[PDB]
Structure formats: structure tokens, C-alpha cells
Design a protein around this ligand. Sequence first.
Ligand SMILES: [Fe+2]
Ligand SMILES: [Fe+2]
Lengths: 648, 662
Amino acid sequence: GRYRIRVATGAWLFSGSYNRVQLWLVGTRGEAELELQLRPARGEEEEFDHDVAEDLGLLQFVRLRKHHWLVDDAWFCDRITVQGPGACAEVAFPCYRWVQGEDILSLPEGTARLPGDNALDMFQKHREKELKDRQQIYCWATWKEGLPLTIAADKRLDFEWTLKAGALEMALKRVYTLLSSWNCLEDFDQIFWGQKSALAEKVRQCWQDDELFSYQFLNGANPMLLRRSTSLPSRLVLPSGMEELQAQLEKELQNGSLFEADFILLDGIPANVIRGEKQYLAAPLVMLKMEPNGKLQPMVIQIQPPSPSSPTPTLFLPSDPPLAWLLAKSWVRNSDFQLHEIQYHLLNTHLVAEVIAVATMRCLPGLHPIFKFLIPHIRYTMEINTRARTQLISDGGIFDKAVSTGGGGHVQLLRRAAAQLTYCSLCPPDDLADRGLLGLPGALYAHDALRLWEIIARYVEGIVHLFYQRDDIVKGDPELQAWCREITEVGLCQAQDRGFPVSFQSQSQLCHFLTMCVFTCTAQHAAINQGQLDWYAWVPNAPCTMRMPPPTTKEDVTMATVMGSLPDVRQACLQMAISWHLSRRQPDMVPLGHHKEKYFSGPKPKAVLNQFRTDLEKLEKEITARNEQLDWPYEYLKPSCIENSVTI
Amino acid sequence: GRYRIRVATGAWLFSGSYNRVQLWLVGTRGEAELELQLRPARGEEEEFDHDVAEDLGLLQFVRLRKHHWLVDDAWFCDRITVQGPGACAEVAFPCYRWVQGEDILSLPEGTARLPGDNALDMFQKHREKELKDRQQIYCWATWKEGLPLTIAADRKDDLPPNMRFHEEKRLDFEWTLKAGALEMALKRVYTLLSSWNCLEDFDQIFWGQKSALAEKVRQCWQDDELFSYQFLNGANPMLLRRSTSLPSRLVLPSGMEELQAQLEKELQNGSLFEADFILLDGIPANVIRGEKQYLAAPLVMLKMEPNGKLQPMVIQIQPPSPSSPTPTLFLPSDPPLAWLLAKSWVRNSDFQLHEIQYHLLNTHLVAEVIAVATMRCLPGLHPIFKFLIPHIRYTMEINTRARTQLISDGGIFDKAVSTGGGGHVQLLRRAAAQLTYCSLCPPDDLADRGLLGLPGALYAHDALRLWEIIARYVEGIVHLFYQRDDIVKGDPELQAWCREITEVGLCQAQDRGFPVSFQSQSQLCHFLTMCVFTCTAQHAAINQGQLDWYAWVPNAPCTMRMPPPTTKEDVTMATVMGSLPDVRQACLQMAISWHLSRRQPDMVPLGHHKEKYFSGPKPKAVLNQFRTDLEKLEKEITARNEQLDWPYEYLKPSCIENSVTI
Ligand SMILES: [Fe+2]
Ligand SMILES: [Fe+2]
């Protein structure tokens, strides 16, 4: 028989000209040792023809052993397609990994399989051995107690914070030295350098108007906090002489047009000590009304919650001294930065995707269809999360030197956010319905996220119904239930009380969970991550820290109070530096659904992926056609802008 | 005997509101003592009337003293115009100078006068004592040995006060320094955490230009057509010459006979062009922050296509050596990164020979020599001084600022550029050896380089048009004040000025074609056309292209941090990025390019100096003609540039600075 082996190689660090790899073509009945002289080249899927004597039959495995290689040499094998005798289709053998060590690497058949009761099966023994190895090379590690577990620590964020921190402090000190005329609001202009978008310049022009401030809770960088008020909040205590606000609040409550954004998760979080001076934090509540034209308007801001020391806090109105109102809006924006960069971007998207990634690597073998479905969406997640825990959110890290929740309070905020990290909150048809953002016309994030949920759910159902045709197939899959408990009981630290499933009992439960996983890894991260390029490039639109306590009297708020509460040159330039470094477009960006890795080998999972791409193209056309009529477009959930995994 | 005195004031810093000037209306038959009270206004000139009793006759001088002024009060008098009692015209007395001290300042009548043999003439005695004072105020200095001499000023405050910046220029310079410093500090902060591993990382510091052509350079810098277009119409169009023969350093190894055939075919066609950077051979490279920079002396061969565009043929980054007899010849059909690195090395060397030879030496140092020699040997009455004083303004201060900040020891050039740290001085000495009078005259230089008649050579076309317009201007003024050639020979101040430029200022440049004397009207006309073109048009051509072509750092790097490549297959992106400057050197190159090439808000266009040194109707009609011809050339260049994808805008006469000011 004539076997045609096409080797697709991702990357290679071959020191020599040619390297020899032994390639056993393991089939049902017999195997065939072949020697391959690897001469890779970019975009060259090296073909090798071989004439065998024995009949291997249907191929099942491909075994690779790097015969007498160099120590430094490395080879990332993408896939091995073997065309057997006759016109038989090119059987694919997904590798997509660094072939490392002198041990024999076994690549099974690319058709995805579920485990069975036959322990003497070749794919069953292979997936058991692969799971035993991948539970050894992927280990859970607790970073902080009460937080979800991480991967064990044993180019877009690749630096050293200890080496760069002193030079960054000297650079910020020289900016402080050559620029010390800071008294007015426009003085953030001379540090406003970079690739500012049209939306970023529109934020610069129009951040002070109340409708942009209200627009940020719906379609800003953090659209995850605004909920429709079913009742007035218990922390909203109105003092005497403010019965007109009470009448307006009850009128907007009865009309269903009352909305709230409560930052109560930040109450009691100890603030950072940045360069000696103690920063300050608050837990505001902004009450907003939905005007009949479709635009939110702010009703009231309560910067601090009630306390035993202050039973009724100051309620700042949009019809107050304009600088007190500006400072109240800035405090809300600072707290939106705090709850955005910790709860909704770091916890709800990064740490959840890292838990999904580690559990997918640990409990789903390479043959499993859910692994092949999820491995494009978990790429570089543990790497970026480890770099974040090493540099961004470490002790004395980036957050300890830039952000007011840093220095220890961000860990407490992560604990409090993981306390309320619910499975309802990670699903937009559940989160937006719980928050009452369904049917809202101006809620462009909610509309795009619901449309993405429909498309991603179509993708998930299309993949799942090929391999799980009945509910008892979902129940009887032990690797799937192990992956489910590894997410819920182990990775998310017993999150079954937070709505996460302990086991899968139906097709639809698994479909909802996998839709949540793909939405968290791709769409929710895009919606929570693309906002810092334009909304957070202007430091007064979202301060990273506040250097003064929140105001208690409106008439004492001057420009000196606003400018003293707003960050100085070092904190603001550091915040813009981080926001510019994190939200820049990397050249290796893979859009959603457009991964070039062919893990599945059947034509029907590929057809499901093509329908996913077609629906995403239709959604991108719809969002683009919607956005021309809007002066404030929502481009954060365009599928071309949605990255295929949490990589930043 | 009613005399009308209009005192036009250029500038003033008055601590009080009571400043008095004693004035003397010195005529042929006597003088009149008058007292004026200066109340200057912006955009207006002061009006006075005085009745005299003695018939002063024809007015010749106006003498000024500041009667009991404060120490900090300063007055910059523009001119004083006196109208007599009869129906005679107004008589101009140009000052355009800071009136300082308790001494009497004498301003002669504005008609330009040649020196004469009458030693008892009042104007002759005045110009003699004026030259004696100016030769003590304007002194030569040897900044470095082997270079053209500079004004004697260790710092900018040691300069003569008339050569200082005015308030708008100085304030703009300080604002430019702080704006560049803030932009560099912001770039340092914002790209300190960023990675530096690909050419798109140079995008991270390129935002904020607002220069359209620089964005086009960003789009098309890897194009070989743009790389070859820069030799004709880029920031440095002064090096490319047509090859009359193959260069001797162009050593082709075995097996490369096709390139030999192409070079010989383009040589026999006459379309072979060369840009040789051999003046940089052996120049010691900088060591910036302990990191060794690297230099090279490339040679790039070019061919004119029949469409009119240059295309590159071969780059030899290093010249042949006893250790390396045949260096690597880089071709457009090479591993792309090796050819990109070779083009980057050529553009580094173009930056080196542009910012040192053709900008610092050929324009700034030559205009400084012209300025210092004009202020040493030409008095205020001399027509050539009145001709040349608008074209030498702010040159001494910008050169002193360069010698204290930019090209000083440990200066900005020693912190950004590969020739810094001492090698730029050796490069300057070598370039001053090649600083010929032919190279400063665009008819002679563009005939010598063989760039005449090229339709795509827009610098050459605009430079010849500007040369003939400026030469018409020079011819009008000179033929007004020199009817015959013996009058040119018989002018001792003119010959002294010629010797001060050639023998003294340019350090005995008679061997480089510079005249030691003027023997004809047309020799003086050619020399003055060279002086005006060097001060105004050549500096605009060599200077205004720094932000359009130098803002994108890979288009023209200031330095190289890796040795030039010897093998083409080993050139990776890591080699290109490690060779190209890091973010601090690149940001400093961007800052200096924007600082030097931006349009000054106080820019005087060429020919549009408002100072009225000449009093006669005829020199002013000549200046009018000059401005009319310049606006005709402006219309021609604009109509040409409207049909060009890559327009040449540096020689528009509205954009040409009237002197070397930046
Ligand atoms: Fe992220
Ligand atoms: Fe210049």
C-alpha cells in the first residue's frame, strides 16, 4: 500500500538542516515504522510517500519519536494527514503541540469520540493514559484562598515588573518634574498622547455631559453592572427636604424606567497606598432614569453607602453645584474602573476562563469532542493569567502601584466577587434578564450579547448534538462529568451554591454550560476588554485611583477638590500606559470562530463551524449597519473584533 | 523748518512709561538737538514734529542716545524717517538694532553707499568706525580644528545682542523644547512596558505627526521606489550623482555577472546613478549608554527607468577592506529582510551625511561664516550688507544653540546618532574637505552630479528655478550698486568680506573653489546668489524634509545598534530590529526631526523681509520683482504638485525661510 503522509508544522527551532522523526502508522491490525527527514518551511505541509508491505487497515494512531535530536531543538506539530491506499480520504491526526522529550508521542484518530466501557479499546487506553499525563502536567494551584483555583506556576505581557518598575518610576518622576502646572481639568490633555480612537476623542470632548456618563453603564467599557430597579435600594436613604427626588424615583420605579448601578461590592475594601500617599475608595450607587427617547439619564449619585457613623450620606444630583456633581460622577467612574478591572474583566472573564482551561486540559482528553470544541477558546489563557498573577495583580505588582484597590484590597474584592460569581451572571440571557436589560433598545451591548449567545449556542448545539444525541449519553460520559465537577467543585471552589452545575443531566444543560464557556472565553472578554482603549484612555472618564476622600458637602467642592481627588501625573500616566499596553491590537489575533486548528476531522463539526462563521458574518454586517446610524456606536461585540480566546 | 520724525520701533522692554531719546538730525550744514519721548505701540510707529532754526541742508545722519534709561530697559529701533520742511521726500535711517548703553548710536541715511577714497567723507568715517566696532563685537572662533570658523560665543548669552532671537522666536524655541521633551517623556512612559520586536512597534511612537507625507512614508517605506525617490526628492537630495563610470569600490564577486551586465547597460545608457557614502568610511561610531553603535559607508546604485523613476540595483553596505576584499552586495531580489536591512543601512548613512554634511556643514556652518563675515567686513552703509542682513538673521544663535546643545560634547547628537561621540567632528572635517564652491551652487552642483534635465528631480528643477530667480535679484541689486567690474575690484570692504568668507571663515577654502576676491560683477553676483541660496533655499530643501522623511524612524534611522550584515540568509527580524534604534533613540530622532523641520510661526518667507534697509526706489523695485518671480514659482510648484502623488514642497518660496533660523 501507498501511504501519503502530509505533515503540517506550526513552528520549529531546528538547529540542523534535517531532523529525523520515527513515524509509526498504527492501524487496527498492524503498525508501520517510517523514518521522516523533517525539512519544515513556513506554509509547507511536508509530504512523504511510503510503500508498505503489510496491510495496516483502518488507521487509528500515529506515533512520533524524535530520533537522535539536538537538545535545544523543538518542533510544534500541527497535524499529520495520512492518505491510505486507494482514494480513501486523508485521515487526519491533530497534534497541535510541541513534540518534546524522547518519549513516543501518540496521536489518535481525529474523529472525536466519547469514552466507552471497553477498557481493552485502543482509544480508551490512550485517553486514560493521556488523562493521567495531563493531570500531572496541569495542576490546580490556589493563588489566594476564596478565589478560583489557577494553573500551577511550576509577547503582549512578557516583561519583568521588578526590572521595569524602577525605570517606570523614574520616567513618571521626570513627567512629574517637567510638568507641574496641575490645577485645571484640561491639564490631562498634555498627557493625552497615543492612538486615540474616534470614540476616545469623543469621550475627551463630551465626558462631562450626563448622557455619556449614563451611556457608559449600558454600552461603555463595563456594561455588566447596570440593572433595572424592581424597588428602591435599601442603601438609598433620602434625607429630609429631598421629597421631589423621592417622587421622581418612585415615578421612574412605577414606570419601569428606573435603573441602578450599585458598587456595593467595594464597600470596606482597603485602599492602596501609592507612593506613600493613601488612596481612597467608595461604593457608590447611581440611580438612572430611562427617558422615552431611549437614553439613560442620571437621577442621583450616592458615593458612600450608609454607615453607623454616617446614617444618611450625601446624595449628589445633576442639578447640584456642577463640580460636586462632576466629582460624584468621577467617583462613580473610579468605582466602575475598580469593579470592571477586578470583578468583570479579571474574575468574570480571565479567572473563569482559566478554570475552564485547566479543567479542560485535566479532565477532557484529546479525543473528546468537548475538548476539541474548547481547545481553540482556551489558548494562551493560562499563560496570560500566570503573567497577570506574576506582574499585574501580584504583591507589589502593576495593580499595587497603579490602582486604588491594589495593595491587598483587590484580593478581598476578588473574594467578594467570587462569592457572587454566579452561573446566571455569566450567561447574557440570564444576566440581562436578571438585570432587566432585555428589550431595552439603547442597550447595544445587551442586543449584541444576546445575538452572540444565539449564534454561540447554535455553534454549541451543533457540535453537541453530533456527539451527544441523547441525555443518557450526556449522563454516561464520565470525562464530561469529571470536567464539570473540576470546573464547579474544584476549579471554582464548590460553586454549586452559585448556580454552577455539579453534573450534566441533559443535552441542553451541557449546551448552556458550553455556551457560557465560549461566551466567557470569547465574547464577554471582548466586551469587557475592548473598552479600555477609548473609554479609559481619558483618565477623568475613569480614574484608576482617587487621592482624596469622597466629598460629603456639595458647596465645598471646587476645582482644587476635583483635581486633588483625580489622579496625579504619575497615576494618570501609569493608567494610560497600562490601558494602552493592554488594549493594543496584537498581530497574532484570531477572530471568533476563525481558528486554523483542525481538531475535528468529521465534515459535520466542520459544517457547524462554517455555519458559526456565517452567522458571525451576518451579525457583523448587522452590527455594522446598525452602527452607521449611531453617533456612539457599539463595536465591542463585532465578531471580527471578538478574539477567539482570553489572551489579554 | 518743520521736521516730521517717524520712529518705527521693532521691540521694547520698558519698565516705566517715561523713556526719552536724544536725537540729532545731522545734515550737511549742521545738526539739530531734539528730545523724543518713546511710547511704542504694536503695529504702529511714533510720530514727531520739531521746528529747527538752522538750515540743516541734506540730512545724512540721525544720532540717538537713551537719556537716563533704566538698566533693564531695552529698545530695538527699526528705522527713523525724517521729512523736511519743503516738498522733498521722506529720508530713511534704518537701524534695526538694539539701542544700548550710554553711547551715541549714529544711523546714516538709508541710501546704500560704496566705500570711497574720500577719507574726510562723513559716511566713510562712519563706516570705518562701524567696521572697527563690529570687528570687536563679531569675532571668529575655532569650535573644532579643521572646521569653518564660528561666531565667538561659548554659550548663547555671549552672542552679540543684535544676533539674538527676538521674543516670538525665543518663546517658540522654548515652547518647542518643552513640547518635544514632554512628548519624549510620554513616549518613554507609554512604551517602556511595550515589546520591541517588529517594525509595527515603531508605530507605537509614530502617532501625532500630522504630516501627511510622513504617513505616506509609513505606508510605503519598504517600497524600493520610495527608497530611490528619497535620493532625488527626499530630505537629502544632495548626494545622488549620475555615474559616468562604475565605482572602484563596487567589487562584484564571482557568479554575479548578470548584475555586472545590468550595471554596464545602465552605465552605457547614461541612466546609472550612484549614492556613495564613503565619507563615512572609518568614522568611529558612537557608544550610547554603554551600547556600541555601528556605522557603515554604503554605495547604492540606481537606474532611471523610462517612466522617470529611480529603482535600486545594488547596495554595498561596507566598502572593500584588506580583511574583506569583496563585501556583500545586496540586491532587490534577496531574502527580503536582508535587503530591508541594507536599505536601512543606506538610509542610516543618508541620515548621517544629511544631518552633518549637507545640513549642518553645507547650510548652517556656511551661513554662519557668511553671517559673521558680513557683520565683520560689511558696514551698514554697504549695499551688500543691506542685501545680506535679512538672509543671515538668527543664524549665529541657532548655530550657537546647536554647538551648545545638539553637536556639543555629550550633547543630543552624542545621545541619539551613530556618528556622535566624536565621529561627527571627523565627519564634519572630511565634509569640509569636500565643501566646494561648486557644491553650494545648484547649477554647478547639479551639473557636476549629472542631475540636470531629469524630470523627476523636483529638487533639481525647483533649485535651478530658485537659483535663476535669486540670481536675477542679486543681479538687480549688484548692477544697481556696481555699474562696472573695476567698481567691484575697487571696493575694499567687498574684497575684505570675500577674504573673510574664503580665507578666514571657511579656513582657506580657495583650494575648494571659493574666491579670494571679486574681479567682475558676475563673479560677485554668482557668489551672492550662492550666499542667498545657501542661507535660504538650500537650507529649506535640506531641512524641511526631516519630519516628512524622518518621523518614520525605519525610513531613516539615526543609529544602528548591530553591525551591518555580511550574510543575507542570517538576517532575521531580530537582526533588523536589533540593528534599528531602540525606542529611546528613535523617539529622540523623531523629536529632533520635528524640532528642526517644523514651520516657525515667526517665519519670514524668502524675499519677504519687512526691514527696509535700502532706501532707494530701485532696490525696492528689484525686491518687488524678486517677490513677483517667487510667487510665479510658487504657482508653478503648486500646479506641478497638484498632479503628483509624492509632491516636492520644500522649495515653495512661501515655505522657504528667509535665513537659517532653525
Ligand atoms: Fe482580558
Ligand atoms: Fe537647519
